[PDB]
């Protein structure tokens, strides 16, 4: 088991990931119930500047990026962990 | 029936619905965003990319303004 | 359909109620997923003084009362709605 | 003066603001998103369609990119 | 001075405090429970076992009824 | 396996556990209370009356101090 932020995110996503999609400036990341804030916290700890911000509900996370291009780059980075 | 459950819940919980771009902002009574979000998530609506719920406001994300209008219109039909 | 706070609570509980139990000074009220705050809000709007306060998670509400006797009285009042 | 409460709260909890398209992302101190969101919703500005708050991040949805800038600059005025 | 931040926040958001047994129930303005909870957790007082915050209500769990009173009175000092 | 899932999740998310009276206060990493709460709710533990989760703290309610100790000891066994 690896402990850096990315590895913690990767690990957490193994159990928690449900879906990821994007539209325009935002990524919609769906998690297992009650896991949105947990995953949001790990994401916020990655410190990816391309991520303008994250807003987490209970099982859904919205990641806002400045541009569609930034959104894709962040989505791709997350996808890599899956 | 998910749709019927949502309609029932919206009677008391609904406050406002609007949209811009590819999203719908649905305002509920205080504390109701998650409850309504749970019902909307149970809808079998492919066009609904997801919902993110605060306390009294739900953001419904669709891919496109056209999908957004479709989804909003379907919610409006329940009021 | 009736619209007073109690009737709104009663109505909301028809769909949302899962379990109610108590221990000492507190009631544990379990709801359908994502319904704790919704039910907490209705409960807080009843203005029952015997209720010291409510703290809601996602599907679980803790109602704190000053005494076990108060707790029972509030639990009984809720039970009546079910 | 009506903004004094929001100004006060921002002075203690504001971290950063940015916007993109129809949205403003406002970061607060941990656990302050709902608190600032309530103050923002209380403003009842028609340029703000709504807010969704997480724990430390608020998304404000405005009706247009122009409204978004207008709202963002109004908030920045308070800092 | 280390409590100044919590005092400030309470001055704007505190509604009421009560306690029973091992617990303190602190009511805040809507959406302020997590915000005050964060300030309280930052205190890292060993008399407070922890806090759980809803939207406008914080439950502080202390180790004993005596600790509960001690903590409640410390908080009341700030008002 | 619910227990195994919880154990796996606790590796990263666990911070502190304590108890008083008939409750357990379980502190997790920021933002993890609900995630861990979901796992604990999936345990088939009759003694656990329920959990209420904040942001990083979970309150686990049991009926009695004896049940509380039992439940805490079972959680401690996972660390
Ligand atoms: N258990 C629940 N709260 N379910 C509803 C989730 C609603 C929405 N997807 C959100 O994450 O904010
Ligand atoms: N009682 C409250 N938390 N009010 C603030 C709500 C802020 C925002 N509309 C949301 O639903 O996330
Ligand atoms: N979808 C979830 N968040 N599930 C976990 C709920 C945890 C706990 N029963 C609470 O209501 O706070
Ligand atoms: N302590 C936490 N919950 N941290 C994660 C916050 C995630 C995201 N920025 C939000 O506010 O929803
Ligand atoms: N706007 C709301 N969520 N209101 C209900 C609050 C319920 C309860 N007092 C809590 O803080 O958890
Ligand atoms: N980032 C935060 N919301 N921090 C405050 C947490 C307050 C309290 N321990 C809870 O979990 O509800």
PDB file of C-alpha atoms in Angstrom, chain B residues 31-60:
ATOM      1  CA  UNK B  31     -32.670  20.869   4.725  1.00  0.00           C
ATOM      2  CA  UNK B  32     -34.390  19.257   1.774  1.00  0.00           C
ATOM      3  CA  UNK B  33     -31.772  19.321  -0.946  1.00  0.00           C
ATOM      4  CA  UNK B  34     -30.349  15.887  -0.132  1.00  0.00           C
ATOM      5  CA  UNK B  35     -33.790  14.293   0.258  1.00  0.00           C
ATOM      6  CA  UNK B  36     -34.954  15.553  -3.128  1.00  0.00           C
ATOM      7  CA  UNK B  37     -31.538  14.733  -4.636  1.00  0.00           C
ATOM      8  CA  UNK B  38     -31.938  11.132  -3.491  1.00  0.00           C
ATOM      9  CA  UNK B  39     -35.325  10.995  -5.287  1.00  0.00           C
ATOM     10  CA  UNK B  40     -33.924  12.586  -8.456  1.00  0.00           C
ATOM     11  CA  UNK B  41     -30.984  10.215  -8.462  1.00  0.00           C
ATOM     12  CA  UNK B  42     -33.529   7.378  -8.441  1.00  0.00           C
ATOM     13  CA  UNK B  43     -35.133   8.642 -11.644  1.00  0.00           C
ATOM     14  CA  UNK B  44     -34.048   6.637 -14.605  1.00  0.00           C
ATOM     15  CA  UNK B  45     -32.992   9.741 -16.524  1.00  0.00           C
ATOM     16  CA  UNK B  46     -30.019   9.226 -18.773  1.00  0.00           C
ATOM     17  CA  UNK B  47     -29.835  12.955 -19.533  1.00  0.00           C
ATOM     18  CA  UNK B  48     -29.226  13.791 -15.895  1.00  0.00           C
ATOM     19  CA  UNK B  49     -25.455  13.607 -15.508  1.00  0.00           C
ATOM     20  CA  UNK B  50     -25.821  13.956 -11.750  1.00  0.00           C
ATOM     21  CA  UNK B  51     -27.038  16.088  -8.893  1.00  0.00           C
ATOM     22  CA  UNK B  52     -25.060  17.837  -6.219  1.00  0.00           C
ATOM     23  CA  UNK B  53     -27.081  18.873  -3.210  1.00  0.00           C
ATOM     24  CA  UNK B  54     -26.322  21.456  -0.601  1.00  0.00           C
ATOM     25  CA  UNK B  55     -28.786  22.218   2.114  1.00  0.00           C
ATOM     26  CA  UNK B  56     -31.668  23.709   0.240  1.00  0.00           C
ATOM     27  CA  UNK B  57     -30.332  23.835  -3.291  1.00  0.00           C
ATOM     28  CA  UNK B  58     -29.736  21.156  -5.830  1.00  0.00           C
ATOM     29  CA  UNK B  59     -27.584  21.534  -8.888  1.00  0.00           C
ATOM     30  CA  UNK B  60     -28.622  19.189 -11.655  1.00  0.00           C
TER      31      UNK B  60
END
